[PDB]
Scaffold this active site. Structure first.
Site, mmCIF file in Angstrom:
data_model
loop_
_atom_site.group_PDB
_atom_site.id
_atom_site.type_symbol
_atom_site.label_atom_id
_atom_site.label_comp_id
_atom_site.label_asym_id
_atom_site.label_seq_id
_atom_site.Cartn_x
_atom_site.Cartn_y
_atom_site.Cartn_z
ATOM 1 C CE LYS A 13 -2.732 -0.720 3.647
ATOM 2 N NZ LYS A 13 -2.537 -2.090 4.247
ATOM 3 N NE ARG A 82 -6.200 -1.891 8.081
ATOM 4 C CZ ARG A 82 -4.925 -1.591 7.801
ATOM 5 N NH1 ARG A 82 -4.442 -0.375 7.977
ATOM 6 N NH2 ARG A 82 -4.125 -2.541 7.312
ATOM 7 N NE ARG A 121 7.382 -2.850 6.541
ATOM 8 C CZ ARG A 121 6.126 -2.438 6.710
ATOM 9 N NH1 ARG A 121 5.586 -1.543 5.868
ATOM 10 N NH2 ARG A 121 5.403 -2.893 7.717
ATOM 11 N NE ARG A 138 5.121 -0.751 10.575
ATOM 12 C CZ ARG A 138 4.144 -0.659 9.684
ATOM 13 N NH1 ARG A 138 4.324 0.041 8.559
ATOM 14 N NH2 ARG A 138 2.987 -1.261 9.906
ATOM 15 N NE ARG A 149 0.999 -5.659 10.822
ATOM 16 C CZ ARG A 149 2.169 -5.316 10.279
ATOM 17 N NH1 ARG A 149 3.314 -5.567 10.910
ATOM 18 N NH2 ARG A 149 2.195 -4.725 9.101
#
Ligand code: AP5
Length: 190
Positions: A13, A82, A121, A138, A149
Site C-alpha cells: 500500500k 479496512r 522490510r 518496524r 495482523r
C-alpha cells in the site's frame, strides 16, 4: 481523483502510495502513518491507539473514523476503510463533502508472501527484493505480531471487498509483480 488503497499487511500500500503521490501530486491520508505520528508525539490518541497497534489488533472504528472525518475537512485514502463499519461512515462523510469515491483499489497479494515481505522490510526497502547497496526495522513486523495482523485483517477484508464489489467501484490489481509493473497497472486504472 478520489482513491482508496486497501490490502493485507505488506501487500504494498505505502509503496504504491509514494509513487501515486509523486506522479499525480495529491494528499495522502494514511491512518497507519497518522497513528505513528500520534504515537511518537504521545498525544491521548497515540496512547490509546498504541495498545491495539503493538498487540497487532485494529484500533476501534470510532476513533479511527473520528480522526479521518476531521482530517478530510483529490485524495488518497490509505489503509482506510479496512472494515465495513468504516466504509459505511465514509459514504456519509463523502456525501457530506460532495465528492464520491472514483475507485477503490485492492492490491492483491497472498498470505504466504506477506510474512516474508514484512519481516524482511527495512525503512521503505527490502532485504531480498529492493535491496540497498549497503545495509531501521518496524516494531510491529515481528513474526508473532505479523501473524496476528494477517488474522485480523483477512477477517475484515471479505466483508469489505464484497461491499465495494457490489458497489461496482472495486478494482483488483495483481500485487505479486515487480514494483513498477504493479504501478503501471494502477496507472492504467487511474
Ligand atoms: N483503518 C484502520 N483501522 C484500524 N486500525 C488501523 C487502520 N489503519 C491502520 N490501523 C493500525 O495501523 C497498524 C499498522 O497499519 P499500517 O501501518 O497501515 O500497516 P499495514 O496495513 O499492516 O500494512 P503495512 O504498512 O505493514 O504494509 P504496506 O501495505 O504498507 O506495504 P509496504 O509498502 O510496507 O511494502 C511491503 C514490503 O514489500 C516490499 N514490496 C513492495 N512492493 C513489492 C512488489 N511489487 N514486489 C515485491 N516486494 C514488494 C516493500 O519493499 C516493503 O518492504 C495496524 O496494526 C492498525 O493498528
Amino acid at each position: 481523483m478520489n482513491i482508496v488503497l486497501m490490502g493485507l499487511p505488506g501487500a504494498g500500500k505505502g509503496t504504491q502510495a509514494e509513487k501515486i503521490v509523486a506522479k499525480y501530486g495529491i494528499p495522502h491520508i494514511s491512518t497507519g502513518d497518522m497513528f505513528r505520528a500520534a504515537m511518537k508525539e504521545e498525544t491521548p490518541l497515540g496512547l490509546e491507539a498504541k495498545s491495539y497497534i503493538d498487540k497487532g489488533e485494529l484500533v476501534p472504528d470510532e476513533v479511527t473514523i473520528g480522526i479521518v472525518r476531521e482530517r478530510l475537512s483529490g485524495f488518497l485514502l490509505d489503509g482506510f476503510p479496512r472494515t465495513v463499519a468504516q466504509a459505511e461512515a465514509l459514504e456519509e462523510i463523502l456525501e457530506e463533502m460532495g465528492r464520491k469515491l472514483e475507485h477503490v483499489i485492492h492490491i492483491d497479494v497472498r498470505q504466504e508472501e506477506l510474512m516474508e515481505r514484512l519481516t524482511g522490510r527495512r525503512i521503505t526497502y527490502h532485504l531480498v527484493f529492493n535491496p540497498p547497496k549497503t545495509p531501521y526495522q518496524r516494531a510491529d513486523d515481528n513474526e508473532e505480531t505479523v501473524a496476528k495482523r494477517l488474522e485480523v485483517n483477512m477477517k475484515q477484508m471479505k466483508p469489505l471487498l464484497a461491499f465495494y464489489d457490489s458497489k461496482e467501484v472495486l478494482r483488483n490489481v495483481n500485487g505479486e509483480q515487480d514494483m513498477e509493473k504493479v504501478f503501471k497497472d494502477l496507472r492504467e486504472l487511474l
